[model samples]
Target: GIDPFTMLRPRLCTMKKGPSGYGFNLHSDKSKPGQFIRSVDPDSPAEASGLRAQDRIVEVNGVCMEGKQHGDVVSAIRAGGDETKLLVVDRETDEFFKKCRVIPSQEHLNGPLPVPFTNGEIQKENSR
Candidate 1:
């Protein structure tokens, strides 16, 4: 039998400025506490760092994400400074842990702002 939590393996990823730009976009499920990735910019720090759309963030900088609002999560990530560490998990990995980082970008303080989506939008997207 496989332990549900043990299946998660931490993967390290570094974010840096790319040829296209820096940073990416993030969105959270209003009905849930987890922050779900909305999209990753092409050739950006996020893409270079292996951030994928729909990836659910589990923790940031060794802090467990619990009952956090979307704004809170975004503020934490931005405050991470030059090196932001993240612990994430996704359904595709069956709850595997993913370690991520945000490094200095040539473009200067440029990163995706966390966007909160309403339940109505979620339903609309799901229907599509």
Candidate 2:
């Protein structure tokens, strides 16, 4: 049986932009209601953080995308292009999280990787 309580969790992905860009693109079928990953480049920065194709993008950088606009969604990702956080789920699991009454956000999801609120300024802070 599918357990909504345990199996419906979202992926809290954090990744910094690489020289080749974020390495993934947002896609939505005009006939569909939501957006999903079109593709992720080979060994892209996003791939390093476990971002997968076909995962529904729930949130971007702390902003909820439950009511996403295609152009805006694309814009937001690049608007904050340096570092990004994406809460994503597969098509089936997306409904589970909803049925379980779990709103997507960093604090409410899994984080077995990457500590909370980490940044790229470690070197600068270490010398201070």
Candidate 3:
């Protein structure tokens, strides 16, 4: 049996600045909680970093974005020292965790993400 945290654990992705920066844009939504990825150009550092459009940016450089203001959030991604460290989850995973009030744990920066929750196996239930 697999644990629910397999679904709840976030992916830690790193992007180093190339000739044109991370080669992606980080967008935010007033309705949603955290930041998202966008405009990831082909053959760019962001694309090579396993980043895609619309995935939730749960953490910046190992810092979670919860209860943070837009100014702080913007600054967090900005001023990067030629690199970006992000913890992200896909849209469906973001939605499930958001409504569930489940504070998904952030995985360490050490290992590759062993993706078991990418299939949406354990989602939807009462909050207790």
Candidate 4:
């Protein structure tokens, strides 16, 4: 959760053109009506763009974020395409953080690969 009094500012990030996808994880705070940065992958576009954990996202593409679902926020990020702008605040310091411009590699935007499952695992699930 973030203090409501903290100031927020816009930060722009231009993701590279490719299939890897943004390398960051965001989750809806169960105790509040906001989204928080869960993780920022190393060498990912998010990290390069100065994104860090505990950063609370206040807006996306000029759209205020409140009462939005996890999927909804993710969709917004993806919908922004190669260029995405965000407004966020640091949870610990109550300060805003954003990058002016960032361009990630095309492959960096690709979605993660699905984990392979075994037949025995599937069989075990059926038994359960």
Please give the distance, in angstroms, between residue 119's alpha carbon in candidate 2 and its true position after superposition.
39
> lDDT for each of the candidates?
0.54, 0.71, 0.68, 0.56
Residues 72-97 of candidate 3: C-alpha lDDT, one tens digit per residue: 87688776678877777777666666
Best by TM-score: 2
The global Cα lDDT (0 to 1) of model 4 is: 0.56
For each candidate in turn, give its C-alpha RMSD to the true structure in angstroms. Answer: 15.6, 13.2, 7.2, 18.3
lDDT of 4 at 76: 86
Residue 21 of model 2: what lDDT? Answer: 74
Q: Estimate each model's TM-score.
A: 0.57, 0.70, 0.68, 0.56
- Model 4 off-target regions past 4 Å? 1-14, 17-19, 93-128
Per-residue lDDT tens digits for candidate 1, residues 12-116, read 346643454347777877676678778877656776666777776666655656568888887877677665555544563422211222221222113231122
- Candidate 1: worst-modelled 10 consecutive residues by lDDT: 100-109
| Candidate 1 Cα misplacement greater than 4 A, ranges | 1-10, 16-22, 94-128
lDDT of 2 at 15: 84
Instruction: Select the stronger candidate by TM-score from 3 and 4.
Output: 3
For residues 1-128, write the lDDT of model 2, one tens digit per residue: 33334555577778898885778877887876556888988777788876878888878888887776787777787787698888788666666555555556665475332322344456556653
Name the candidate, 1 or 3, with the larger TM-score value: 3
User: Judged by TM-score relative to the true structure, which candidate is superior, 2 or 4?
Assistant: 2
